[PDB]
Design a protein around this ligand. Structure first.
Ligand SMILES: Nc1ncnc2c1ncn2[C@@H]1O[C@H](COP(=O)(O)OP(=O)(O)OP(=O)(O)O)[C@@H](O)[C@H]1O
Ligand SMILES: Nc1ncnc2c1ncn2[C@@H]1O[C@H](COP(=O)(O)OP(=O)(O)OP(=O)(O)O)[C@@H](O)[C@H]1O
Ligand SMILES: Nc1ncnc2c1ncn2[C@@H]1O[C@H](COP(=O)(O)OP(=O)(O)OP(=O)(O)O)[C@@H](O)[C@H]1O
Ligand SMILES: Nc1ncnc2c1ncn2[C@@H]1O[C@H](COP(=O)(O)OP(=O)(O)OP(=O)(O)O)[C@@H](O)[C@H]1O
Ligand SMILES: [Ca+2]
Ligand SMILES: [Ca+2]
Ligand SMILES: [Ca+2]
Ligand SMILES: [Ca+2]
Lengths: 353, 353, 353, 353
């Protein structure tokens, strides 16, 4: 049979699976599936769900979220629902391996400091799916996939892995990591369970507190944040057109979005400065010049400017906070695929049980 | 009152206690008790442990390791847990003295270059237990106990004490010693804290790295090494039948045991050659012909052949590495008993305070 | 006053009270009273209930269930109706102490992982009834009462407490517990609120869904399950003679009972294997040989064979699932009485308030 | 500007701040604030807390512990909550400096062998508060503050610093120190994280084990120990009047307080005798005559007599265990102020960040 190395980014909001053979460098499969499993509701009529499938994954479960009970397999970057997570990894295996006969060797991205229970949860929802697994911190894989191997060696290209600080603000955890060329130790990374889902929850609370029984689902309170959420000083007026009870209302969520998204900064800044002061004095001056924000939370309006302003005001020697880029979804999966093709035979973990 | 001279081999894995009267040469008591103390767990049901004992020693603590919290009194050939060590020495005193009224004079075996703190640790967990103590290095006691006094003087018997090199590869330390007829000086012996427990730890790491959350206890990772561990070139395939999570699996640990046990050789060979080149040039040609491996580590499959091969390949004049024999457990205790019966009245150390 | 140690198995379906003096080993009082309180209905004619009692307990409330409103004090192994539970414990106190003057010291059996609120519920409906209380998990007490103290020490008697796995499938909870010689920790036991009452509810739903308005009470849907309920493959045809609307009908409930009782296996097997894989690898090979099912749910037709089959096909090393025996009702009460006579003076909890 | 030298005793139960100018010997500010920070709860009605303060410190937080969430900044003599500790040191700075404009130079008392992390926790919660810091072990500062400089030189006054052994039994740690005239080395002191809060925890466990759901807060289980706690043989009957569930009960806590308080002796005695045997033989005969107990734990009923009895029974040459005195709270702050006024310009540590 053939072996398929799979860079797997098991996220709280969206997972991304990449599949390629050994020796080569191209990417056979590259899918970005929202981490959600929809169990088609009991009593569903035939023809409502295309193919009468009883379990939907990703967008197929988000479009049919009216007919399906949605369950997010992952919460705070760790597996919260083992059965849904197993179903979802089983779906993504068929995605990364359409034939279903190849031996999958997956490097799955775990949070920065994932507890051994949170790692056995991933090694248990991957048994019988992935033949060999390898659990690497998510921000290190983000640094490894953001790195342009085609542009290495050049002088006009600064390596994001040689000396940088990666602030992978996902949708479950916000992992900061001191990526200093090698596999980061337990002290080179800090994971805060406050990210996109926490800002969604804060907006849900500040909406059910001022506009009670609004009925706005978390999937819409998330779109409000993705479209209008911002960090920094309040922006008023900021009219958000919502649908509350069938009727179209226009809420004023300037202060609401400001307080919801600035809590993320207030959470990740004490851990940003902690790792900045944990770095070696010889290398921190360039570490400040190479601070990179990845993950979905990098798309928050004005987060790099606010973080660089807060690091400059605190006296850090000329920080330069940078955004990862447009491909913030595949960075952890690209890094996990690069770490799969570079993993030694003795590095892969055997999944028995 | 009567005096009982006790040859005590306080080991990291097994301690062997011998007891005999003065003047005679027979051996009254001879016990080999695994150095372990199991404190019966809180809430134990009556009748689970025979006699409702709350502290179990040796095999009684290994058979009842499910109901008892086991603590190893000794780590790296030095007392690591003083309370468990004192409990264990108190048990072995009752073993060497069932009446409990005789004055015990014990020669305890310490590592090759045991620090004065590591020796006061043994003289402190023996106060009130042994009336007089005498601390002699463990490999010299192994040389003394391996020596056959019934076969001395004969021409067809080579004395292991007259001029030999003893590599007592224990379970905590691997002490190499130039046994040249007399009490070895501090430069005639080298102690490396790498032995059976270090190979057990290396196997535990190599198993939790490839077969994560295997749950194999150290007492089973140790039996794997005793049954299949080997030094030399890798032997594949070498199937080890284990029980991981209730289910019976068959792991492939050829390279694993190879890398685990060859680290012991890589550790003890720089100290083997150091003392071979420290010996007098007049006597080193005979030293190489009398290289003897004792301790549990002598039972590793193919360790004398590997060490003789490494010593011949390095150009040493015809080395002949030999195993101690089947009685590798009592050799330090036999030597300590022979050193107790030959100790002058001024050699015994008084334990006060 | 005299002290009476009372082993109390407060069950969801039946509670077993045992009473004995201190120091002795005989059992003075031993009653099995169905956990139910029948409050005699308003307007009851004199002479309908023997003695004109207004509150009936156990069988006296089951025979007079036409004249009394029955309330089950316990649901899911925890006290659900505090007033009925206090009345019922007050009745069982008079059962264990007919004189009503002795100081009762009761060891009540709680579920495996009973929350502190579920324990204060039992310590609150026992205040003024039991002078000292002691709450121990129900499966551990089943292990302690199944143990035959007359045959301890013998070689031909395997101890159910030294190392075993007890599946106390009651009528409210199904508690699995790693009984390994000592008081089980919070991780050695899992309690699932799915047992006899859950299968009763599943049968009630599957009967009100196919045979609507059948009028079969839960007390008859329960007898259907006790008489014909089975786990494993469906058995058709399986005719159950019932009385629906006064008329005698003969339903076909092969698939119905199959699906109702196999849900219990589907619920308790993920928690069975969880503790099988939680046990130490040194003792799991014996744990699988000593898997014991107690409680009412042990009487389900073919549950030990089915669970042994499911554990064998999953690769567990030669499991051997055994049934507790005929005396499955007194095992928790016998164990609580053995734990009362062996409880230290500082183990008894004082009930004030 | 003016400089204010501040002897700061940052305790687990009570922190004492002393402030004085340079050159003089009088004490400008002397406050004893219980180390607690009460964050006023959300939704507090105006007028409940005097001044509508949102953060209360010391007694102001203990009197309003019903309206405020109390957090102890310090646990085991080290800073456990950095934010509450920073607020608390900020309050104590305003206490030692009402004007808030003077340059504060604080000598803060750390435990005996405070780890460098536990010292950077104090230098980090003091940055921007104290301009210069100096961390000295707490028992040495207690020895320095117990010293009567007004009585030095006299013949009828034995100096507590020239040669003594201080058992500062605080509320977080119980530090024993060989105070032999100079700054004690790392081997002249032992810190045990078992003191007042550990006895409070032991009493809480022994009360929730015998009188379950008693609801007695730690602040009341602490007053029980302060009013009735004793070391030595059990004192029965010892009736303690408590309030359990609104109702006034009278518990018997003779054995309870005995076992709770004698654990402190059993913990601090192996470290007491360790330093007694670490002292020079020339000075140990005087050291035993000058054994002094300070800190809150010195107020335990019969602790000096019990420790002197235990030291005499062990054969130590005529020990004389003495209590510090009534002013056991300001001794560490008095010594820290005496060491601030005697600290050289190069001894002060600059706090930058
Ligand atoms: N433009 C935006 N503004 C604000 N938030 C956004 C934006 N785009 C995405 N997000 C948030 O980012 C989250 C997704 O994060 P991302 O996809 O970067 O990493 P992730 O895979 O979710 O991280 P993890 O692996 O920790 O789950 C979503 O929950 C979403 O709420
Ligand atoms: N056949 C074998 N193969 C490999 N290792 C073995 C074998 N037999 C014993 N050992 C190892 O030897 C170790 C101890 O045996 P031995 O009695 O020779 O040393 P020891 O006296 O316990 O050690 P020390 O003197 O350092 O305390 C054990 O930990 C065990 O792992
Ligand atoms: N032969 C049988 N077949 C199927 N179910 C049975 C049988 N006998 C009893 N049961 C069920 O077992 C339940 C009683 O369980 P048991 O008496 O073993 O413990 P319990 O007191 O219910 O414990 P708990 O209160 O923790 O549930 C009853 O509800 C009944 O439905
Ligand atoms: N009379 C008493 N009996 C018993 N314990 C007491 C008594 N008085 C005070 N305590 C205990 O002493 C503790 C306070 O110790 P003290 O004030 O002597 O030093 P501390 O500053 O708290 O110690 P640290 O500096 O280690 O925090 C309190 O927790 C209290 O429980
Ligand atoms: Ca991510
Ligand atoms: Ca040895
Ligand atoms: Ca039961
Ligand atoms: Ca103090």
């Amino acid at each position: 049979t053939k072996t398929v190395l799979v860079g797997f980014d098991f996220g709280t909001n969206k997972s991304c699976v990449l599949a390629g053979t050994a020796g080569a460098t191209d990417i056979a499969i590259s899918k970005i599936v929202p981490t959600v499993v929809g169990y088609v509701k009991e009593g569903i009529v035939d023809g409502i769900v295309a193919g009468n499938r009883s379990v939907l994954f990703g967008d197929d479960a988000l479009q049919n979220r009216l007919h399906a009970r949605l369950v997010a397999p992952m919460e705070h970057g760790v597996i919260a629902h083992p059965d849904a997570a197993r179903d979802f990894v089983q779906h993504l295996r068929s995605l990364a391996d359409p034939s279903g006969q190849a031996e999958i060797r997956a490097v799955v991205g775990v949070p920065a400091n994932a507890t051994e229970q949170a790692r056995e949860d991933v090694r248990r929802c991957a048994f019988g799916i992935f033949d060999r697994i390898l659990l690497i911190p998510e921000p290190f894989l983000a640094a490894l996939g953001y790195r342009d191997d085609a542009r290495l060696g050049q002088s006009n290209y600064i390596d994001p892995v040689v000396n940088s600080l990666f602030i992978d603000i996902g949708g479950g955890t916000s992992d900061i990591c001191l990526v200093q060329g090698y596999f980061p130790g337990p002290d080179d990374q800090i994971s805060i369970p406050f990210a996109g889902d926490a800002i969604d929850q804060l907006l849900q609370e500040e909406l059910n507190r001022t506009y009670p029984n609004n009925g706005l689902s978390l999937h819409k309170v998330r779109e409000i944040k993705e479209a209008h959420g911002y960090v920094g000083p309040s922006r008023k007026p900021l009219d958000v057109k919502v649908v509350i009870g069938g009727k179209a209302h226009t809420l004023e969520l300037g202060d609401t979005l400001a307080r919801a998204c600035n809590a993320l900064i207030d959470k990740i800044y004490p851990a940003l400065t902690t790792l900045i002061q944990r770095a070696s004095s010889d290398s921190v001056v360039t570490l400040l010049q190479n601070i990179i924000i990845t993950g979905g939370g990098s798309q928050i309006k004005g987060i790099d400017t606010l973080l660089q302003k807060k690091l400059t005001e605190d006296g850090f020697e000329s920080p330069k906070v940078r955004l990862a880029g447009h491909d913030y979804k595949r960075y952890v999966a690209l890094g996990a695929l690069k770490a799969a093709r570079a993993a030694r035979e003795n590095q892969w973990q055997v999944l028995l049980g």
